[PDB]
Design a protein around this ligand. Sequence first.
Ligand code: PRO
Ligand code: PRO
Ligand code: CL
Ligand code: CL
Ligand code: CL
Lengths: 475, 474
Amino acid sequence: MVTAKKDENFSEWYTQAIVRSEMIEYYDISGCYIMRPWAFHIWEKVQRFFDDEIKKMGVENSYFPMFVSRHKLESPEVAWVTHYGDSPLPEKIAIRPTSETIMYPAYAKWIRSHRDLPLKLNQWCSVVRWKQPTPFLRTREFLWQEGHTAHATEEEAWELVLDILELYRRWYEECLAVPVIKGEKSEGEKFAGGKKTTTVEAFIPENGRGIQAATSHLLGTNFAKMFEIEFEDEEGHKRLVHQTSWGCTTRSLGVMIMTHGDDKGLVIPPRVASVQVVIIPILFKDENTGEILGKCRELKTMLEKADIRVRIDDRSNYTPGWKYNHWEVKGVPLRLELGPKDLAKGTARVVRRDTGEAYQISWADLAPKLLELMEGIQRSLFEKAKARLHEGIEKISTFDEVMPALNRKHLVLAPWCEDPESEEQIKKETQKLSEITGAMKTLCIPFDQPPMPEGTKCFYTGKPAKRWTLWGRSY
Amino acid sequence: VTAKKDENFSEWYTQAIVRSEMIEYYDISGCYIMRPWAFHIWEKVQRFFDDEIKKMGVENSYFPMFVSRHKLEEVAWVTHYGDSPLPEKIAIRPTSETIMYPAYAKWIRSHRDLPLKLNQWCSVVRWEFKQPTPFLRTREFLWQEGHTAHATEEEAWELVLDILELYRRWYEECLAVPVIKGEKSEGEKFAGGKKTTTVEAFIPENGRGIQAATSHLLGTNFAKMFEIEFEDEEGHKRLVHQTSWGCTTRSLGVMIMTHGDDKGLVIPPRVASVQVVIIPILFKDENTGEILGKCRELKTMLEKADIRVRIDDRSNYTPGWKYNHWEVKGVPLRLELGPKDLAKGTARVVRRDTGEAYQISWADLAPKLLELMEGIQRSLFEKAKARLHEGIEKISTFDEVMPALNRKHLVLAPWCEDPESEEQIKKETQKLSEIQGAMKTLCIPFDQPPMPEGTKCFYTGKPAKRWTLWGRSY
Ligand code: PRO
Ligand code: PRO
Ligand SMILES: [Cl-]
Ligand SMILES: [Cl-]
Ligand SMILES: [Cl-]
């Protein structure tokens, strides 16, 4: 059971929710965590969804080495292997922080003709980047997928950037039921070396902080010229390829926990629940023990015929109430209870994890009714989170409105001139003002742009505003 | 491929893997990029094995790749991040055991907590490889590693054998590679384990056995080291009985070696990223769409029967070049479509393993190909199975060893299972080859021939316990 309240000590609540649901075991090396099966199931669900979808686009999986040489890599985040035993290595080598400099010389070799394009590769793997750490959200080693494509034209690459971003929106919004906002990163927050970076952003109300949930980069021709990735044209001329890079990590899991967890623990959206329905037989004295177990197995068969993922917790060595607490901590969306009274009526009692509402459902009606309940729960998790997001964003016009909004734990949407030095000035000014990390930075320039009335000044510099921009305190 | 597989096998292997586009080289020695043509085979066997161990209640997990100095008291030391030194150096994991088993000691308290069954899909780094080659001797490789804890030895041993059977199916049903189940000798088992089981394969071209996968009955020794104890139903503290089991991308190497021929790779249809390559008979600048349009219609029809299909419509290569290209990659089936094929409603299909050709009506295309594919798969297995049984000589005395070794064979010999005799045999077989390469045990096969009363060990003279399989090996 969880005892910390989510709206009181949020970080203690998070620690308790992920430990007591058996998702995480803490580790002696700061920022590394053991990922226990209950978490890994969710990761497998979202991985299967994303892997199928990118296969439909013609992306093929591959595996590149986890080590990278000093020359190919050339910064402060990179872990260096420098010794073997007590002897120093002749040349130190790095553990991959990301694989651009690992794959792209191979791309340079593999690409000769426009007939070789597009090249579309993806890798499921872990990476290492070395603030204070948080399980799932900021860890030193994390699991991810990284996709890397090369195209003959820029327009084709950008289309792929946007298709991938849409997939990431589905990953968060259709699987995890986490609303996100699509936008571009500012020039100082984008991938180093790339042309343009797009992103989905999520919000965490309890601390009012924005978090980058996934990114899709138009690399353009910048890496192509640094790695000499050229192809021959139909015309016969040599051209640089146009590249994209895109990645998504186990941060998504943390975002889901924070988004849907409550004072009793996890709430797992049915689309990623390894167990959607847990069937709990109520055995007390020997009150029709075998008939109960048999009817439970029947119900499991019947529900699996509608592709519902069902476990029967018929373990002897635990009490039913213990089983209720266990699967509630764990976040299983639906609990089905069956006792001698329930066998007598031809019904079963069903409790939704998200709200606690109980239903008596006859056996014949179980499958369609539970499908309806699961779709209701998924949709309701999403809509409540989306409402919290809508009320977490203040639209403002001048700098004076910023500190009040931030202190309500809100994001700000403000007209901005998009000058890069102004972002640094704003970060430092908001840090200083919050003293009396507290800094506000750009989360993204949203795709969905309100109208910009003629003569709207930048909310900070007074120069003409270019676009509406989403700022907040960040992860 | 110019090297001949029976005549210069090392060379044949290197040429065949590179010309097949399965791997790419890298600027850090011993590391190889797995390109999709090979990674897809990994993905298929991974999915099969993972489905089957999930049917057993094994669940996947992830453990960090670093180990502290504190917890370790020939490791790779990470000592800096950026230009900044770490306060204390950390290390890259030597074992996963050293990270998982303290966690196991924490998680297991009561008989209620058993059995615990975990698996990890990950990569592994080994820093001392002698001279590298793809899939066999590499600085980094992929694998799965399963670790379980049970309340009794019988349950753990049951799982050891169930996993071994899954491994047999991995090799034999996916990769069409025949393997032999057995238990390792005392001198070749996992160090602190009770019993190690193995599937073994055989490479006829150099006559070497190669270990395909291992499933260990660890017993209670690791439980004693790490204090993985549980309280049983009567209140007593007992030690858990552990198992571990693993299998690696070396499996891909063994498939190459088994099925490849002088033209190059032959990939079993069950795991081939492309099962059917469609080759339009065209030449540059001629494309009117008639031939490519029919090729696309055929692709759609074959994909409806869940056949994995690729069309090679590249303009700059002649059809002969493409035939050679896809044969060197080892696509099981090629479908040639040209002007007469079009003008008569047929297609010409060629099997990669035998070179036999079929003129097939478009209507019959999808059924027939399914048939062809299953045939190819079965044929690949049974031919290899025959080679395996022709490579094993059943002997009785040491006198027969050196001849059999020189026929590039394995020997099945009655043995007293004394470990020192195993190391003596390694030394002598080795000295004899030098004067003309050592011969070790591969396994004691589960399938034991009858042992006539009073048979003596082929080397020591003492009473024989069991028939043991010996050979040179990888
Ligand atoms: O690390 C990143 O952000 C990009 C996207 C995935 C690969 N590299
Ligand atoms: O190295 C081995 O053979 C065993 C397999 C699982 C982990 N360790
Ligand atoms: Cl653009
Ligand atoms: Cl069950
Ligand atoms: Cl020799």
